[model samples]
Target chain A: QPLSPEKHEEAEIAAGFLSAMANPKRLLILDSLVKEEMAVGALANKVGLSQSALSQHLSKLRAQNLVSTRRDAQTIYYSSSSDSVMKILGALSEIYG
Target chain B: QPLSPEKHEEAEIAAGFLSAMANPKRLLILDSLVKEEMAVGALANKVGLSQSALSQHLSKLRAQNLVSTRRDAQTIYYSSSSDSVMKILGALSEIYG
Candidate 1:
């Protein structure tokens, strides 16, 4: 780690992004976001997990800037924050699928 | 998360790679390894950490297979286990200096 506090903060920010995706639902959520934007309800249905659990995961991701949301009436659509995440998913794609 | 236990294990393995580099000393170790191999004692000296702290971090890296060592009598040399680590450090290089 750098002696500067700023660098440590940056590393933590980056780690937060990675750690947010460290979970199964979170990874699935990010991968799903890459293909197409989805609302909270839609993501819950698509991945077939409980709403609260999925919401918590989404909150962590959104907090970390890994995912962003747009409002469409009562629904909110979520999408990837940047290509870095897509890059990670691409790497994982080659590794697993 | 994947339903399959095998995929979970794979994720853990991959996460282990990222987590191994999540720290300052470990990241420095990996970055230094890309340039040239160094013995544990050499790394301890290069990174300016206490030998025991450096050794503990090296043991984690070795256990995760993110690094490997060669024995030369009583001394051991360690180096990056794969190009993926280089890829990661390269990405970080652009991000942080």
Candidate 2:
């Protein structure tokens, strides 16, 4: 939080990003993607969630612009997109480190 | 989001912090406090919430360790606590700026 009336609009967007990342399994998904891009099935396996559940989470993350996707043949792959994601996650690493 | 299975326990905690900041008004409160510490009355005025509602939100933020407080006679002052907060808020500023 900072003191700028101008900051509210951005804080709204930023809070949305944070809210989307707030779920434990969703964080697990993002955490997996941060290592390397992975197909939906791979991510589902890695995060120990059903594919449908993971896809729903991925959709939310995609809407927040925290992750992006690519199609390679029959499979779609997901990876982290915005540096904000990196910075927030990095901050967590530092906090825990 | 980083790729460490060892990161989940911390991710849950980090996600909790993010969730607390997810609301627009709460973000407003934090944004105001980021400028400088303020009492409940001043904070309610700044964030445009009722004292009771603001107090509830402050309680949530307090539980999440996002902000801290000091009592000075009849007036209590609140301020941001962790650097992770600044980093997340700073990330938002950069994203919007």
Candidate 3:
């Protein structure tokens, strides 16, 4: 569509957010994260990925602010940070999960 | 993520759904449709595209079941049909609209 400058900007931001979730693994990751915050290893197990692959997906999601982290002692805990991320995952769960 | 068979199939379905929305114009079109059902021309106007261009976008979304249509007498009306699409649009509006 021929959006105005404001809508163009909105589209770009939304597109980037969606891009972070475009992958199958990332989609499952966000879906899980929205339900509860989890440790890196726990998330990896939940998504059925190795720690390394899950780390890569987490990094991508974190860059988009779709995933956020907390530190409890030395462990890093990840959660769905954006409201949009949570909502999209919930929606996908109802339809696809 | 390396999902089991169920999650794998779910992920593929969602990935395909997200692919339809990966484009800027399609994103805007879905965002608008979720707000209200509109005539083809009305939707074109709202999304700031000509009918032809909007038609191309609608075809893609329709195929994905992201958008749907009805006939009001002789005029065709378009609207968001999937709950996921509406939810995603509402989410995007909060963050990026």
Candidate 4:
């Protein structure tokens, strides 16, 4: 069925979420989450960025609510926040790889 | 379901398709098509561009195979060529509107 204008507005929200993941590092981060939750340190290891840099990107993802995090001892472990996050990753994996 | 690597490749192709329509004018052109098919001249009028400029953008859409055209007497008519085009537009309207 054709999407309603309201649904189109929803699609835009979805698109903004996808657009946020368009960057290579963020893409990598998402891909990593598909594997398992990880701390910023592990994310840095997987994506080959400094802890500071990965956290910065993570902050962006967090702002958009693409990712969620929890405290475990001294470490912060992050995972995809919502189904939309997984959906966006699925879309990207379908698009880029 | 989580998309496979092959599907992710398809998503990239799809994203490339979405990216083509990412521009505001192109988005508007597509929105116009949702209502009715129009020729380059009419598109220019609806979209408020010179016929020549509209033609150039039409040519790009044509190149991407996102649109198809037919000749009727002296004028040409164009329409969305695929459901994917519709899907993209639906996605856009959902995103931006």
Top lDDT prediction, candidate number? 3
Interface RMSD per candidate (angstroms): 4.9, 4.6, 3.6, 8.0
True contacts kept of 2: 0.54
For this target, which candidate reaches the highest TM-score against the unseen true structure?
2
Model 1 agreement with the true structure over A1-97: per-residue lDDT tens digits: 2234554456566556566665655666787788888788878877666889888888888787788889988888988857777767666565446
Query: For each candidate, what's the DockQ?
Result: 0.23, 0.47, 0.38, 0.14
**lDDT tens digits, residues A46-76, model 2?**
7677889988999999888888888999999
**Pick by DockQ: 1 or 4, better one:** 1
Docking class of 4: incorrect
Order the candidates by TM-score, highest first — what do you get? 2, 1, 3, 4
Error of 3 at A23 (Å): 2.6
**What ranges in model 2 sit over 4 Å off?**
A1-6, B1-6
**Alpha-carbon deviation at A86 in model 1, angstroms:** 1.9
Residue pairs with backbone atoms closer than 3 Å in model 3 (clashes): A25-B1
Whole-model lDDT, model 2: 0.79
| Alpha-carbon RMSD of each model | 3.9, 3.2, 4.3, 6.2
TM-score of each: 0.73, 0.86, 0.69, 0.57
**lDDT (Cα, 0-100) at B5 in candidate 1:** 54
Error of 1 at A90 (Å): 3.0
- What lDDT does each candidate get? 0.71, 0.79, 0.80, 0.66
What digit string (tens of lDDT, one per residue) describes model 2 on residues B6-47?
556666777787788888788888877876898899888777
Q: Write the per-residue lDDT of candidate 4 for residues A1-97, one digit (tens) a residue.
A: 2234653444456555656665656666776675578778877876677989988888888877877777989988898756655654444444444
